[PDB]
Amino acid sequence: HHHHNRQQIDALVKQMNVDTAKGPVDERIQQVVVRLLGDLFQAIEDLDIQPSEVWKGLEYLTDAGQANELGLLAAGLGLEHYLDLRADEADAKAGITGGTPRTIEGPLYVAGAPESVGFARMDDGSESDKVDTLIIEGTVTDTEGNIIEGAKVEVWHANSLGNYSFFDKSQSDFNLRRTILTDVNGKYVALTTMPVGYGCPPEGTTQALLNKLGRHGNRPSHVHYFVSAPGYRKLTTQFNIEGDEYLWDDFAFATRDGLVATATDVTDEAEIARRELDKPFKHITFNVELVKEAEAAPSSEVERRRASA
Amino acid sequence: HHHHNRQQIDALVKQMNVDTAKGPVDERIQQVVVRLLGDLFQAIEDLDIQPSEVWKGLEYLTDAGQANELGLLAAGLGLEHYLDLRADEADAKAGITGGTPRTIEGPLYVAGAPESVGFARMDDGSESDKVDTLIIEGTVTDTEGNIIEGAKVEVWHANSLGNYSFFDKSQSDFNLRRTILTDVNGKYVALTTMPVGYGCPPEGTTQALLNKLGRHGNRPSHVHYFVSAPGYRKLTTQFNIEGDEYLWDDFAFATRDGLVATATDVTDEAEIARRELDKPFKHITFNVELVKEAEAAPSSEVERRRASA
Ligand SMILES: CCCCCCCC/C=C/CCCCCCCC(=O)O[C@H](COC(=O)CCCCCCCCCCCCCCC)COP(=O)([O-])O[C@@H]1[C@H](O)[C@H](O)[C@@H](O)[C@H](O)[C@H]1O
Ligand SMILES: CCCCCCCC/C=C/CCCCCCCC(=O)O[C@H](COC(=O)CCCCCCCCCCCCCCC)COP(=O)([O-])O[C@@H]1[C@H](O)[C@H](O)[C@@H](O)[C@H](O)[C@H]1O
Ligand SMILES: [Fe+3]
Numbered sequence A, B: 001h002h003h004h005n006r007q008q009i010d011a012l013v014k015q016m017n018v019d020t021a022k023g024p025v026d027e028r029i030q031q032v033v034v035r036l037l038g039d040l041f042q043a044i045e046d047l048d049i050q051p052s053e054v055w056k057g058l059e060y061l062t063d064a065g066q067a068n069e070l071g072l073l074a075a076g077l078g079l080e081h082y083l084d085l086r087a088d089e090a091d092a093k094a095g096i097t098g099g100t101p102r103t104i105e106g107p108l109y110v111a112g113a114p115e116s117v118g119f120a121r122m123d124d125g126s127e128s129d130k131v132d133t134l135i136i137e138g139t140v141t142d143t144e145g146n147i148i149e150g151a152k153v154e155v156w157h158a159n160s161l162g163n164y165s166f167f168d169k170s171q172s173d174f175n176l177r178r179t180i181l182t183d184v185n186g187k188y189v190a191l192t193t194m195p196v197g198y199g200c201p202p203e204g205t206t207q208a209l210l211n212k213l214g215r216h217g218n219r220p221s222h223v224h225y226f227v228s229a230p231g232y233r234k235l236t237t238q239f240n241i242e243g244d245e246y247l248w249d250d251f252a253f254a255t256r257d258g259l260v261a262t263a264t265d266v267t268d269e270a271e272i273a274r275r276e277l278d279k280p281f282k283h284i285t286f287n288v289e290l291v292k293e294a295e296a297a298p299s300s301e302v303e304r305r306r307a308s309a
């Protein structure tokens, strides 16, 4: 089945994509195209991939882009997690230690959420008779415990059905999405509802491929974070909730030590009144430690096309 | 920049995509995913590809699928031509010689065209005052010159502006697309207009990438063919027209010896009348030789998602 060797493949890729160039070329794009196309041709030779199989692959990728699921596919195949493994190794090689650990952004961030200082209520109350109330609170500090005032804490999470606003058009714009600036004591408080885990769209392209791989498409319950402050490295992270069936079996491999929180139960009448609530609730503490920016530090910001509203 | 070696990459890909499998797996899909993902991770290590670059790559692929241009990108990068180079080498290894040579289908075939016996007029006459008339004719035979009656000759080509019907909604359905069954003398005749070459959609995703590579996105004038008959190997081919600026500089690399025809000029009054025309015209002869199907022959049919109307 080997019709071309790697020398012959490299020569053909060069003839088609490099020899044909006239004038200014983007050298990085040229480098990446030449590498990936040569690698594709070699895998076609090694696995004897048939034309019908190549076309099915391209039709799948077309359908995935049309469904806006390529970000989801990157999470599910573990490419998104792999980028984090690389970033962690680059930071170790720089001697960066400390800081709350990073994990994946996922494909569902939306820019433009309501901003407030110290406190936000994240939900619109439309599920109040069908989901538990959750209070999240924490302090943002540097690596020696000094508070950081005015840190931007951005949080987003799913509703009682595992659905996110903006993507789920039945929810109000920005439901369960807020930006909270830490107060004079480095504190943020979010009044919200308990998120549930969820799967991929069952009839979508990501689940179709996972099915062929014998894999589920479920994530455990979590709340996403971006945390940033002047003079500090931006953080992309989450917390997970102890007790979830999928805690250590996330189809996107995002759970890590340091990021699992326990939801405590508050049933005490006095404490409930003090919080201005009328029913028992769940409470999570999630403190965040930020690493100070250094001249030597690799960038911790990621340019990525994100929804906005 | 090397944060993982290939052993470590292979172990991670296996942990994420193979160890997680429960129940029935499609073994071929699993094999291809594991190979391509390991190759991607290795190229990310070797070229130190940054997260922002990965996201830009995925956003490009998303936009390309949304524009329905991934078939066009496969032609332009030379992947489609590479599949033909492989098919030619498999046929040589089988001892298949003879036959009109194959070349690429391209992404613009549409199933359901008008069918007729021996003769078809391909155009609707809407360009008759702005393009030259072309008559194409030929005989379909086996490799020793014996005629084949009832062979299905499917032809499609661009208008005077380089545009194809179905894709260009200004044209009538199936304009310049016909199926002609060879007559009792193995003959087909098509009355049509001269095709012009064309470029990629200038504001589209394929041209955007070609621009970064310093490359043009133009094809020389051509007419596409599928030819099939009971007992014979299906053929995907075209002819090109001598004289085209881009004849040997097709951005999809489709031109080959054996497939370039010369358009002759017919100005003779008697011949024009005999054809029932009123002006000079162009004439192309394109005979087709088909190879008989053998038990040993590799399949020459390609399953691919194609438009229909
Ligand atoms: C880059 C590779 C270039 C391509 C060039 C190489 C590609 C080669 C792949 C060939 C695979 C073997 C084919 C076996 C025969 C197919 C039979 C079949 O059941 O058809 C289909 C099988 O074909 C595939 O889906 C394979 C896609 C894998 C490619 C992406 C993984 C690469 C990893 C990393 C690269 C970076 C990629 C980035 C990662 C983020 C069935 O379909 P589907 O359920 O998976 O999706 C289904 C489906 O196909 C339905 O038709 C659709 O309607 C539905 O919505 C969809 O969900
Ligand atoms: C498979 C790989 C998985 C991905 C994972 C690996 C991907 C890594 C690629 C990184 C490349 C280096 C990035 C450099 C910095 C980017 C700056 C920039 O100008 O941004 C963009 C550069 O990014 C790219 O386009 C690279 C895409 C190459 C991937 C496909 C080739 C792989 C070959 C074979 C694989 C099989 C693939 C199948 C082949 C058929 C500019 O955009 P654009 O003009 O090319 O398209 C533009 C554009 O981007 C506009 O934003 C859009 O609006 C417009 O419509 C579009 O035309
Ligand atoms: Fe999420």
Ligand SMILES: [Fe+3]
Residues within 6 Å of the ligand: B106, B108, B157, B222, B224
């Ligand atoms: Fe064409």
